[PDB]
Amino acid sequence: GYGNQGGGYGGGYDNYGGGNYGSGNYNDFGNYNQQPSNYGPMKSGNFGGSRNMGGPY
Amino acid sequence: GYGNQGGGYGGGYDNYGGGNYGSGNYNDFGNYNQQPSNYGPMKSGNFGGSRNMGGPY
Amino acid sequence: GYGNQGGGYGGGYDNYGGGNYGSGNYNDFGNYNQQPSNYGPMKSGNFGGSRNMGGPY
Amino acid sequence: GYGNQGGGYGGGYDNYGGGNYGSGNYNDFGNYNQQPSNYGPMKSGNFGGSRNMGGPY
Amino acid sequence: GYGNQGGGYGGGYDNYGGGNYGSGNYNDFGNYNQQPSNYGPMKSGNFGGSRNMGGPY
């Protein structure tokens, strides 16, 4: 039984290439750029996992 | 039983390549750039795991 | 029984490549760059684990 | 019984490659860079483990 | 019984490669760099372990 009557199966997440993958924010400051900046804060939610908040049993 | 009536199965997370993977933020300051900066704080949520906050048993 | 009626199974997390993997933030200062800086604090949430905060038994 | 009615099973975390892995922050100062700096403090949450904060028994 | 009605099973954490692994912060000062610095303090949360803070028995 895979998470029946509940969270189930998160899935299959496979990365075979470079660059960013997931929930984290990605700042690529490029090529030959003159003074690039962000000034922006970054908050990235949770990655994967299994969480049960089910009601009374 | 895999997390039935509860959190279930987080899943399969496999990384076969470089670069960032997950929830952490990624700053790539590039190539031949003149004074690149961020000024942005970074907060990254949780990676994987199993959490139970279920009600009364 | 794998975390039935509770947290369940966190999952399978496998890293076969370089670069960052997880919840920590990644600063890559690049190639041939002129004075790259961050100025941004980094806080990274928890990695994996099993946590029970279930109600009364 | 693996963490049934509770925290469950944290999961499988396997690292077969270099680079960073986990919750610690990663500063890579790159290649041929002119005066790279961070100025950013780093705080990294917990890695793995099992924690019970369950209610009254 | 593995942490049933409680913390459960922390999991399997196996490192077969170099680089950083865990919750400690990683400063890699790179290759052929001109005066790289950090200026950033590093605080790293707990690694593994089992903790019980359960309510009244």
Author numbering:
A (entry chain C), B (entry chain B), C (entry chain A), D (entry chain E), E (entry chain D): 263 to 319
What do the authors say?
The protein hnRNPA2 functions in RNA stabilization, splicing, trafficking, and translation. In its role in protecting mRNAs, it is a component of cytoplasmic stress granules, one of the so-called membraneless organelles (MLOs). Its 341 amino-acid-residue sequence contains an RNA-binding domain (RBD) with two RNA recognition motifs (RRMs) and a 161-residue C-terminal low-complexity domain (LCD). The LCD is rich in Gly, Tyr, Phe, Asn, and Asp residues, and poor in hydrophobes, with Val, Ala, Leu, and Ile entirely absent.
